[model samples]
Target: GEIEFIESSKDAGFPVINTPSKTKLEPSVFHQVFEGNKEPAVLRSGDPRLKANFEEAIFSKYIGNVNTHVDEYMLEAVDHYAGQLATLDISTEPMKLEDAVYGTEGLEALDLTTSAGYPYVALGIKKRDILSKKTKDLTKLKECMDKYGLNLPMVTYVKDELRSIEKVAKGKSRLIEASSLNDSVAMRQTFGNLYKTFHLNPGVVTGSAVGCDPDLFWSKIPVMLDGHLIAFDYSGYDASLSPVWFACLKMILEKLGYTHKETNYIDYLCNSHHLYRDKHYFVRGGMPSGCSGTSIFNSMINNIIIRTLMLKVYKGIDLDQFRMIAYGDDVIASYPWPIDASLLAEAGKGYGLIMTPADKGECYNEVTWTNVTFLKRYFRADEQYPFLVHPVMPMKDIHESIRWTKDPKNTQDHVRSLCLLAWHNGEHEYEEFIRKIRSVPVGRCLTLPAFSTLRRKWLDSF
Candidate 1:
């Protein structure tokens, strides 16, 4: 039987099971059982005569001249996937753009976690999808780790790194803590959360920027004026991670095992986990799901389509205009005015992907796509050349910053006035925030810049 999942988790926690399973390397959980690996999955691209599946060969062909970068494992990689397009049994969901609610009246994120009979986490690619590929060898990797032991970096344990990221990610990331950053009790969750962010975070994959500098991948698309913009977000975007991404990771892992000296860095990097409860559903995320490389992968795959659309735009001809900008799971493809969402949905259905009214939008002049509050507009070298558009002060963000700058009633009140100045201190919206930096209040604002001083002789502190 095949599985079909089209949804994303909302305000969700990391994937974890209570009890741990101990077995002699179950093939399902531990993919490191097989050895003497074969070549990468061979696929045919443009010229049938010239086909190279290995990352080095592929990278050389597309990016550089083979031997350009030594790290062949992940010079920006994608593979190890179960090819969702083939394995997943998708349903045909036909929806229209007009059917969706538009305008700034009311727009919030969709919740797919704990709200339905079954929750969907837009957790992209992983090895569990390859249920049929049970025969792949992995003895080399397992043996390497078992032999050398993990010579991990300073942070072998997941707690410290994740806690620091959590502390900093307070206002930046969801305020929810996977586990108490201060201590134990929820250690498994902490481990799982770190694994997801370190390996599969969209920041490491998607090109979404900080509140400005929008249009992750579309920045590379090169669109011209007179082109219609199509904003089609994949409803279950995270579930859309391609099996190709997993395959790419698998080959890289194998390469590291055989070629590298110690399993320290390798194990530290490509750690995997499974529970006796879930069994075969060993989860691993894809690179494109992360914020780091998702944009790169999008541009690489859609380059042809983007260039084609731009050509059409440049020629200033034809109907059904097209342009696209994707920030990992979030996306916006340019199109003609009043295009049918049903047609787009049908096209996506064929590939085990889905489109819904919420995943739909249209823009004639300029509009926003919610990836990092991304702003996009067609250009002529041109009018309102929308770059990283600064997002307005969200009511919630403003509140948090206000709370952050205010004096603490208790030691655990979580003061962070200086943290505010760390990233975008110079912006005008932050001026009110900076004024709070007056003479140190000695309580919550102790670390803040006390009063001020002048140049020549107005050294008040002196």
Candidate 2:
């Protein structure tokens, strides 16, 4: 329940002191060992001394209270989202592959088709597996490959290899790896010089464009952070063959009254091709559905709540300095400045998602949200945001005495006064008396054993 410190014998010739030491050390205490020491116990006396001082000081002051409130909140959110999905009765009817062939004819006549021939061929083979009799028509199969510029033998070979891998890996590794690789490419292109090239020739298809052909339009999506452009993709579903299937899923989820949460929103965005302007627009036959469902409505409300929280806690960020490009749940938002709690919350708000407060330190607040919740989270902000104070000042100044201690630079002389304010108001427990020692420079002297001894004695006075 508490941290305990076992002091070494006095003959050990090292200081065994702590700041405000009269407060019994809690059980979280862990000894620090370091190689090569000149000073035995000085906070910054050398590497060994500094290591030991930090280990004891941090354990005594910071460890042991694990907040489970945020964990409970996330678990509740997951349950609610799952319950909503469970009520939806998804259809088992197979998609109509013939409609995709007909749509390609119409798109070709209009000369509006971009490079999607390979994907169609890829889907055709899957359809053949399900409807073997139909796939036996060699003329129709050749026509389908010609329409999509797909090499029949190569496509078949690749598909067979993918199937082999999927089977050996229990159908998990390949799918997960593909998803991860897609995101990795997306993030890299978002920051690379590709943006400038794409901007100069918006409609031109480069080698990169051909690799992720269907998402080429994503290059033109308008969003920027700190003057840098952002790119993202939401095309995760094939609409031509499976329009009715996805449409039915959308209807069922909506009718079940499962308020649109982040997951639902992402699904709609990734699947719906109707919202974007592209050569393939409407070639899929009909508009599947937009994200204006119950889940999205709830997401909008949550977004407002998050924005309000950011306004209250982080006052420095300019709301207009950021930009968000979202098509449903697939979103890309950016803050050019170093990210902090406010910027992170703002980004999540843009997507109608929230991060648990316990994980907030490592969540969007910390510059990356990948490990905080979902799979394959990557961000341009990861390298930019390093600490809470990084947005306000340089990283080197984060723990400086001027900001955290009562140094002359902070003229309020309010370190002790502020502590006492909480104590006097009964907001904090005062177990000991403390006095302000103004003569010593807080940067150097505050960590000295003499200062620690003084602090301990003063605290005991209570």
Candidate 3:
């Protein structure tokens, strides 16, 4: 039997799972879908055209003619920051790097990894071949160690395999860490917490004047301006990192007392090769999405740029009246006045980066933007209680999940997943559909203990 989802406009527009004919449309969840840009319809998981389109897009953007482009950009950046590079004091820090390797058990065998292009396991080696791949990835790391007079062991292993997300807008490429710097749980946490303080908080400074004088911050309205695309604007790593970005990072690290050796080691870790089956390739540019230090690197870079431009005589904007919140590439600048929405995009050129206008860049007082089509679940501002935001399964996402529930051989897992999706958002009224799953002879419906246990685990997740 075909499951049908009907559309309703009475409640700000959403697709209602109105299958089974008898169950009336329920209002607990699935109430509204953000239709800001309906052009890029969600790609079906089984769509044959998907992988081809994704590969073409990824190749053109990141791989094809990528190295040449990266070299060109690197020359421009290096030329721009020659003085700083000439004088950087990068002293050796091998012991620290060694400690990092042991602390993370960097030599352990890795599970399979994925990549952005065809042969999606771009950097993952099979169990039969990891010894060779590890040997190759180590050559470069060891070369740098010897060049810098560091006595790091050849036993350490680190690599970044690439992966992409075709589900979201314009798809994004991310690196899956295989015992790279991202593997050091302690280091990642320390860095994350350290950078968290640098980002702007709307709650703390928007309504109340904490960082600035209340007299200087008189406007009652606070508008948030989000960056269009961040990682794309300033891709990181060996050939892709803009000279200005590297310079800024170096300046930041130096100011914070990180020796040149420490800085170079971190740089080496990020710029190391990604495996694509048997061959390893260096990432040309763009932030590798899953790198542990990526978030802090982005936040810190954005912080420097924001601080440099916010109240500089050229811009003459009042810092007391403006602030920014940055998480990886997602950046929101909050100010009381109407600034051109394209201002941030234009400013990126200073750092040798580019940005387009944000899709939901629409600015408002007492309102802000969020990723409605975020990775798994679709979240949007709730109607009825307009202030609250709620997560609703995408019509496309749920539409597919619903069909798997009919598969007798593999029904329970899908049912429980669908049930969890509903419960995650307090959409108990969705039981009308779950009731149909009950009739599918699946022995028993999801047990209360099962739901409770998973729900508790979810609560503990970061």
Best by lDDT: 3
TM-score of 3: 0.47
**Model 2's TM-score against the true structure:** 0.21
The parts of candidate 3 lying over 4 Å away from their true place are 1-56, 63-241, 269-272, 278-280, 283-285, 305-314, 349-354, 357-444, 448-462
Ranking by TM-score: 3, 1, 2
Q: lDDT of all the models against the reference?
A: 0.27, 0.27, 0.36
Candidate 1 regions with alpha-carbon error over 4 angstroms? 1-226, 242-322, 333-342, 356-372, 375-395, 398-462
Which has the greatest TM-score? 3
Better of 1 and 3 by lDDT: 3
lDDT for model 1 comes to 0.27
Query: How many clashing pairs per prediction, in order?
Result: 44, 13, 9
Per-residue lDDT over 1-462 for candidate 3, one digit per residue giving the tens place of the 0 to 100 score: 000121222342222211121112122112132112112221222333244453223323342111122233333323332323224332222324333322232222222232112111223323223223334343443443344333110111112111223333333222233433223322333333222222222221211111221111211112233223121122322123343554556655655555675466355343444432222345423444444455556554555454444433236554445455444444445565655434554554444444544434343122234442322344444344443344545544553435422234444554566665564444344544444445444424444224455445544431
1 against 3, candidate with superior TM-score: 3
Task: Give candidates' CA RMSD values in order.
Answer: 22.0, 26.6, 15.4
